[PDB]
Design a protein around this ligand. Structure first.
Ligand SMILES: NC(=O)c1ccc[n+]([C@@H]2O[C@H](COP(=O)([O-])OP(=O)(O)OC[C@H]3O[C@@H](n4cnc5c(N)ncnc54)[C@H](OP(=O)(O)O)[C@@H]3O)[C@@H](O)[C@H]2O)c1
Ligand SMILES: NC(=O)c1ccc[n+]([C@@H]2O[C@H](COP(=O)([O-])OP(=O)(O)OC[C@H]3O[C@@H](n4cnc5c(N)ncnc54)[C@H](OP(=O)(O)O)[C@@H]3O)[C@@H](O)[C@H]2O)c1
Lengths: 245, 245, 223, 223
């Protein structure tokens, strides 16, 4: 239990990678607060995986596009569990569209969730975080390799986290708080399943030749959130089966 | 006159690097349309440097924070000069603030100008651009090196252009349109003068030991906008006196 | 003990980060052979073998790998931790120091990696120990050292492609320090054990999806 | 003729990109010495000197630089364009091909750069010709080539620090090609003249503020 007595906040915790990160942090001993936007039933099942195995959880309905709601969620977590040790920013939106075609709505909405809300949550968490804490952003290997058309705005929104991570590391390093950007490649989830022509296309660009599992992203996040990782900061850390080699 | 007969649009053309880029493009033969937000007198002086030396210019008042106004400006340019060959996105806002302190207003406003409006202008220009065109974003060496606190949001907004540039290059490469991100280091302007303690601090991080000149950034932009640069695309290209070495 | 049944080879394992790596991998149940600088030492019933080999000597490295495999069977893990740092300006550095840094920091990395890959199980791990000087070189005197460490970026990327069909991962761990303090975001040096913890994470069963990556553990030196 | 009065040395100047570089620098008014592979050729009244030297031979490179300086005075510009590409998997590459790629692509870059820097004017330019394979290695067989070219990243960064007090810039131009087509954003190969145009821009009076940079000219191969 390397996270015994720690408090973690996970933005986007109810499905896919987020759900795996909540369960893993809780299995190492952290109390976990997490946000969800879409499904109370998915959130309940995550919360039950935490407690059936003896961990402490708080599920919070909060739309990551709304600045006020996110800051409110972080304060609710703090009232519930005390000051945060760990923040994981896992909210993320994807719309495909060419430069000439993408709707201005769709732009605004990737910026809101993938960028704005990462800063918004980081700022409120930082105001209620213990020294020696950990902020982990979940980015994308598309910050580094964009092999096809249609991903301009999504890649932009994920490459934004590179500079964010560097400058946050400088800001919070005097408090011994680490800040890192985890950059996954394709991960097998319901909305991006390891099945079909697109997945084969993507697997051809990878050195490993399978999609990543949620548990593997979770494992890396947990390592970074842990007592062994106090010297890793400002880094963008690829976990992508060699997609970006 | 390597740009004879070309048409260029410069977002933020009335002062500093933007003014130097307008004059240089026009000196190589391009017709230049440029936007300004602040000062009609600065815009008039740029427009006069273009025409006194025999070039063609259109100055457009347009706030880069306003999506509609920017798209309108690009269409006004097109009505005036015909289809664009060259777009330069040089709008840029800077507020210093720590992660824990930065006002949410100030966040929203760097995102609006440094990120959103770069895409907005690129999209409208692309819809009215000739094959074999050129899109040049003006980023920052702070995408790569953030040596002090207080720059988290500014660095984020400039590292955003890395992924934007990569995915735009993929989108527009079939049309033989190049897309590149020029990343300057400190450049001597009125609001960031090469004088005082801050400049000395910054010069100590540089291999060259002076600030860059507007004309030097302009020279590089013009090279990239030219007939020799059709094979440079998707790149983030540092011009920073070794700030990021 | 997630490495029970596994075999590791550590190029440069007798002091500092190397020693910490050997100690951590052995504590997780690995058998470990390591080089330091034909002679070797071990313990009856123990699973740690110390082999004297200079990392500039191709023959001695290749032999060391083969001795490891003789004792323990195919490798699962290789860690390349040999390293030489000589400061010198471009105008002044002796060609002998150039050649030493190239031999140890670059050549021997490829030599060990090839020999290990000829005797490694599918699902294996190769971890190079690079440096944050590959990305940020803030002072003079480091040109050839930085060169030698930035070489590992390209190597890691191409080796990950080569070996990915065998499910072998290949990663480059880039430490910072283990005048500079103004550059460090967290205001201390790294501990050998910290570097070792990251190596052991990558060497283990949870890291099969991390490959081709250069991964910085440098207190924010390169931010 | 922005290089009138200037002196350039081009390591590997007899064919393709090297030839185009020599041709462009001379057209801008530079005196140009170049190597190709003690013998040399020139024209009476001309300012282009062709010197036979193998880039793996330290002595011959150092001599070539000194011959250039004998003819033309201190250098203003050096372009390092020698290059060897041998394909081979990690498990199979011959150590001789490793050593050849290390000698030519890495060692000789440092050797020429040091000798040039001992005989160069303040305000000078050093341009290494690297490869986009430093950043993206999409297929197997390129590990050692990629290694050799990613080495230039660190070298460029440290040399720019070393030489910045003398106002000498140091940059690494990374070409892509001059199966792959699916990787290219613009759908053609680059022309030798294009690479040369970029080199000449960096070599010139407008580029004094570009230093330490790795600058990609690769049709979007690495995007
Ligand atoms: N292939 C991949 O799956 C892959 C690759 C690279 C990077 N990533 C990154 O990994 C992260 C997690 O995505 P995933 O792959 O597990 O995708 P997913 O299963 O489709 O779920 C996306 C996650 O983001 C949350 N989210 C999105 N918009 C939100 C909003 N407005 N408010 C609150 N939460 C919101 C979702 O919660 P609700 O459903 O409750 O709204 C959900 O937990 C994202 O940042 C993503 O870009 C994923
Ligand atoms: N040290 C440096 O100077 C430096 C270093 C790295 C990167 N850069 C980048 O270079 C670019 C140019 O800046 P500069 O250094 O020449 O700075 P500057 O002299 O202070 O001017 C900033 C430019 O951005 C324009 N701008 C800002 N907000 C705008 C808005 N809402 N609408 C329209 N135009 C707007 C300005 O036009 P108006 O005044 O008419 O509003 C002006 O031309 C920016 O993207 C900047 O981040 C500069």
């Amino acid at each position: 239990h390397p996270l015994q007595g720690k408090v973690a906040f996970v933005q986007g915790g109810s499905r896919g990678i987020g759900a795996a990160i909540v369960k893993r942090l809780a299995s190492e001993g952290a109390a976990v607060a997490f946000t969800y936007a879409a499904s109370a039933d998915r959130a309940e099942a995550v919360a039950s995986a935490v407690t059936t195995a003896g961990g402490k959880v708080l599920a919070i309905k909060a739309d990551s596009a709304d600045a006020a709601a996110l800051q409110q969620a972080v304060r609710q977590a703090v009232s519930h569990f005390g000051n945060l040790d760990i923040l994981v920013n896992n909210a993320g939106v994807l719309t495909l569209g060419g430069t000439e075609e993408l709707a201005l709505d769709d732009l605004d909405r990737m910026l809101a969730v993938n960028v704005r809300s990462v800063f918004v949550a980081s700022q409120e968490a930082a105001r209620h975080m213990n020294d020696g804490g950990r902020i982990i952003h979940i980015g994308s290997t598309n910050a580094e390799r964009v092999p096809f058309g249609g991903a301009a705005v999504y890649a932009m929104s994920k490459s934004a986290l590179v500079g964010l991570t560097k400058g946050m590391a400088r800001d919070l390093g005097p408090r011994s708080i680490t800040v890192n950007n985890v950059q996954p490649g394709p991960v097998d989830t319901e909305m991006n399943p390891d099945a079909g022509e697109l997945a084969d296309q993507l697997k051809q660009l990878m050195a490993i030749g399978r999609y990543g599992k949620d548990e593997e992203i979770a494992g890396f996040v947990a390592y970074l959130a842990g007592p062994q990782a106090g010297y890793i900061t400002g880094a963008s850390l690829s976990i992508d089966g060699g997609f970006s080699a």
